[PDB]
């Protein structure tokens, strides 16, 4: 139900630069015309963002960023919200997120993917541990990540990761980086989504 629900909200994203596809990733719609996407996505050089086959330019949407408290100072989550101005509504699924690491080391985790690279797909692994600040292979760093044992690949960024709190299935947040047996998703707070929705 939920997994079938989130797959429905997952759209393929392509970055276009001079008629060529320069970047591929995913997008997870949470409500209205708002989607959760990798923030490091906009760090790339593009002139058009393809969302579900629809080409758009920067004046077509707004990107709000989430800031998370990590040891006093606040940092920028790799989970960015892309709110389109005009667009086909998606199924509001915010009520399926939560406000804390409501998981437990070793619980069923499922990543939902849908991009131009491997089409629609599901990857399943084990919940590992929560991470305050993870340092990437390119020397960069990301806040509020959740670690897990799962076979992930480039392009899976932006896909929703869901666990099993009790007999409940809840969306943890979006996939950002993966390396060597362990995938990492950028955790998104349920509260954070609600205010953002009231905000828009």
């Amino acid at each position: 139900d939920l997994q079938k629900m989130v797959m429905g909200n997952t759209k393929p994203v392509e970055l276009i630069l001079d008629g060529k596809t320069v970047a591929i990733c995913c997008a997870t719609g949470v409500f209205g015309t708002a989607y959760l996407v990798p923030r490091h996505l906009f760090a790339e050089k593009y002139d058009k963002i393809m969302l579900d086959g629809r080409a758009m330019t920067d004046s077509d949407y707004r990107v709000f960023e989430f800031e998370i408290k990590v040891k006093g100072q606040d940092m920028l989550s790799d989970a960015a919200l892309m709110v389109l101005h005009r667009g086909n509504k998606v199924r509001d699924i915010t009520k399926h997120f939560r406000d804390t690491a409501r998981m437990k080391k070793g619980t069923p985790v499922v990543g939902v993917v849908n991009n131009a690279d491997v089409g629609r797909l599901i990857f399943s692994g084990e919940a590992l541990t929560y991470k305050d600040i993870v340092v990437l292979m390119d020397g960069d760093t990301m806040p509020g990540l959740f670690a897990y044992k799962a076979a992930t690949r480039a392009g899976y960024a932006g896909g929703a990761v869901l666990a099993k709190d009790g007999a409940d299935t809840f969306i943890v947040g979006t996939h950002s980086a993966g390396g060597n047996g362990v995938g990492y998703c950028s955790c998104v707070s349920r509260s954070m989504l609600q205010k953002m929705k009231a905000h828009v």
Binding site: K20, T21, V22, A23, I24, C25, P38, H40, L41, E44, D78, N115, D117, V134, V135, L136, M137, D138, D140, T152, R153, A154, G155, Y156, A157, H175, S176, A177, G178, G179, N180, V182, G183, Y184
Partner: peptide
């Protein structure tokens, strides 16, 4: 060391 899993060309 995990790498950002966006697909770059």
């Amino acid at each position: 060391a995990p790498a950002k899993e966006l697909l770059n060309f």
